[PDB]
Amino acid sequence: ASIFRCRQCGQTISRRDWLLPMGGDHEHVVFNPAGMIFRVWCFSLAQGLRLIGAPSGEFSWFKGYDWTIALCGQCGSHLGWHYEGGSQPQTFFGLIKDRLAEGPA
Ligand SMILES: O=C1CC[C@H](n2nc3ccccc3n2)C(=O)N1
Numbered sequence: 001a002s003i004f005r006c007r008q009c010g011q012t013i014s015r016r017d018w019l020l021p022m023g024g025d026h027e028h029v030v031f032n033p034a035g036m037i038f039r040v041w042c043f044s045l046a047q048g049l050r051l052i053g054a055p056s057g058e059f060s061w062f063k064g065y066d067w068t069i070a071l072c073g074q075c076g077s078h079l080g081w082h083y084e085g086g087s088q089p090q091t092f093f094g095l096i097k098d099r100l101a102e103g104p105a
């Protein structure tokens, strides 16, 4: 269990090696304004996504970061968000853990 794929279609998304401890933890449990709870895992890098729209700062769970919706580039499943416009690091991915499948390289 080293690679993360899209749970719906099996698109290659990220690696356990690429987990990023933002504020001391890679896992952040967050709620959106619609009251949906997400278990978000922070990654330095991801692939196989499609980033939709222009960045927005509204309701950002990570101070100083603007977000873009990250879909699976293959099946269009909402996998999380790309974050940018911040510092150390400038950019990262917040992916919804339960929408990924972990398995061998
Ligand atoms: O960091 C983030 C990413 C985006 C996320 N968010 N989900 C929404 C659903 C409906 C309307 C606005 C919304 N904002 C959020 O709350 N925070």
Ligand SMILES: [Zn+2]
Residues within 6 Å of the ligand: 006, 007, 008, 009, 010, 011, 072, 073, 074, 075, 076, 077
């Ligand atoms: Zn997919």
